[PDB]
Amino acid sequence: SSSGIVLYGTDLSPCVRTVKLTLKVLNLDYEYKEVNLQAGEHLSEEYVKKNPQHTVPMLDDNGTFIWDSHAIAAYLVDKYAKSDELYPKDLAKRAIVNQRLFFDASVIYASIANVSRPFWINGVTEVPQEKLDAVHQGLKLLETFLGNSPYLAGDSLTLADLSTGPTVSAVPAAVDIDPATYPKVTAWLDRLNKLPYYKEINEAPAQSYVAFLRSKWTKLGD
Amino acid sequence: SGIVLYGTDLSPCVRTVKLTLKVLNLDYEYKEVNLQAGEHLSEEYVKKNPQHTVPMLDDNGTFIWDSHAIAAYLVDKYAKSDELYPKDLAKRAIVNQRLFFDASVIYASIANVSRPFWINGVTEVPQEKLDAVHQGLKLLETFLGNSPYLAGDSLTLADLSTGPTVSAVPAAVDIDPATYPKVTAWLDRLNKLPYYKEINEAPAQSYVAFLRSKWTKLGD
Ligand SMILES: N[C@@H](CCC(=O)N[C@@H](CSO)C(=O)NCC(=O)O)C(=O)O
Numbered sequence: 001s002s003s004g005i006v007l008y009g010t011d012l013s014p015c016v017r018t019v020k021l022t023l024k025v026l027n028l029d030y031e032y033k034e035v036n037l038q039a040g041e042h043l044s045e046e047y048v049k050k051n052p053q054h055t056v057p058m059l060d061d062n063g064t065f066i067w068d069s070h071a072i073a074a075y076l077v078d079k080y081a082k083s084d085e086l087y088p089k090d091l092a093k094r095a096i097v098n099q100r101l102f103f104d105a106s107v108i109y110a111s112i113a114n115v116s117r118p119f120w121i122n123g124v125t126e127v128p129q130e131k132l133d134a135v136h137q138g139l140k141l142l143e144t145f146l147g148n149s150p151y152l153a154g155d156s157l158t159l160a161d162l163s164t165g166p167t168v169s170a171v172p173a174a175v176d177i178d179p180a181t182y183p184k185v186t187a188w189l190d191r192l193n194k195l196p197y198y199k200e201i202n203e204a205p206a207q208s209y210v211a212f213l214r215s216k217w218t219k220l221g222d
Numbered sequence: 223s224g225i226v227l228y229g230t231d232l233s234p235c236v237r238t239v240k241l242t243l244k245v246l247n248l249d250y251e252y253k254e255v256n257l258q259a260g261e262h263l264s265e266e267y268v269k270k271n272p273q274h275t276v277p278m279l280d281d282n283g284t285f286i287w288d289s290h291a292i293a294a295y296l297v298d299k300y301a302k303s304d305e306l307y308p309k310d311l312a313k314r315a316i317v318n319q320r321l322f323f324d325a326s327v328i329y330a331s332i333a334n335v336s337r338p339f340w341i342n343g344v345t346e347v348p349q350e351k352l353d354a355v356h357q358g359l360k361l362l363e364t365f366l367g368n369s370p371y372l373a374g375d376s377l378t379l380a381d382l383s384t385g386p387t388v389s390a391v392p393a394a395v396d397i398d399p400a401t402y403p404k405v406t407a408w409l410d411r412l413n414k415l416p417y418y419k420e421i422n423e424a425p426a427q428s429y430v431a432f433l434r435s436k437w438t439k440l441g442d
């Protein structure tokens with residue numbers, strides 16, 4: 001690419017896919033640098049100098065290095081979008097989208113990372129019931145947030161959906177999202193998948209991740 | 223002002239918003255929400271905030287929640303200058319990263335400890351949960367580096383959000399100054415601001431003493 005934008009990532013990370021989705025909706029070219037987490041490429045001296053959290057995604061926008069999928073997506077829309085539909089400039093509307101992003105970070109992501117991180121770090125394959133309960137609590141809140149609106153922040157697709165949709169696509173690694181229990185979540189996930197660019201970026205990597213972790217568990221709750 | 227804050231003082235998330243209101247010199251009405259009586263679960267409350275959390279802000283008929291979202295709103299709407307939440311997009315991205323780090327790492331690590339207590343009366347804390355809190359502090363220590371504040375040389379929303387959250391962490395973990403000298407020094411630095419100590423310190427001590435009195439097992 002000649003945009004000067006570089007994304008450091010791996011496709012099985014939902015946080016990375018948030019950024020790919022954002023770059024796609026903004027029609028931005030970029031260079032994608034695959035970071036091999038299994039080889040510890042995120043822990044190298046040169047990587048950690050740019051991102052001391054040693055996470056993906058990281059964005060290099062023409063010499064400006066930023067990380068955290070939420071912060072990256074908000075930056076990209078404000079800098080590069082031609083309209084504000086994904087991330088409204090109106091302060092009250094922006095506060096709704098921000099709230100949903102902080103909910104993804106603090107509740108949805110946190111609940112599923114609580115399950116997966118012990119696996120990646122310490123090979124833990126036994127998942128306490130308490131952790132599955134916390135995932136369900138987050139799904140119930142999402143179900144209520146969706147209400148009668150098609151998207152997470154209202155009638156239009158926003159960064160709220162591009163952030164939370166991928167995270168929720170990882171949840172089935174640990175919990176079944178039963179449509180009869182979570183019909184609004186289910187309908188929303190299906191609605192996102194009706195957007196070709198979304199399904200193309202999200203669906204196969206999400207399936208790969210879920211199948212992988214489901215093959216690992218030796219005990220899933222009580 | 224027509225601004226109303228719904229909250230309780232022992233919540234660090236609520237204190238973030240009180241600190242923001244204070245630095246912006248905004249007058250407001252403080253409506254205490256009695257979480258122990260379930261006032262956050264009433265029909266009227268959940269109609270405005272389906273997450274049934276504090277803080278919630280009513281800015282003249284606009285209801286918003288989540289301390290990070292509230293604080294960002296308040297600075298962009300009401301501040302004279304953008305020092306707490308820069309308009310430059312790269313600087314904003316650093317402050318936002320810090321806020322999302324507070325939400326996804328620091329807050330999540332300590333809520334993982336406290337929530338089972340408040341919901342189910344769990345008083346036995348697995349070592350894994352304490353390890354997660356330490357991992358978050360280690361990252362914070364690296365973020366601080368040699369800069370006095372979390373996002374660099376000036377105080378920002380990064381500090382007003384993360385400082386109060388970190389003031390709750392001693393409920394479960396000791397913040398050892400030999401392991402976390404920069405975190406320690408930063409927490410002391412915030413407390414040298416009179417408005418910060420006045421809002422934060424006594425409620426933080428109350429919370430920490432309360433939960434420390436309840437634990438029957440703290441890790442291994
Ligand atoms: N709040 C951040 C989370 C990034 C993250 O956990 N990334 C994982 C990959 S999986 O989704 C990662 O980089 N793990 C390596 C590590 O933390 O060491 C964001 O939204 O970008």
Ligand SMILES: N[C@@H](CCC(=O)N[C@@H](CSO)C(=O)NCC(=O)O)C(=O)O
Nearest residue numbers: 106233234235274275276277288289290
């Ligand atoms: N990400 C949100 C966290 C709010 C929260 O959990 N608040 C607690 C009080 S402790 O700090 C609360 O309202 N608990 C009641 C509940 O969730 O039912 C924010 O920053 O505002």
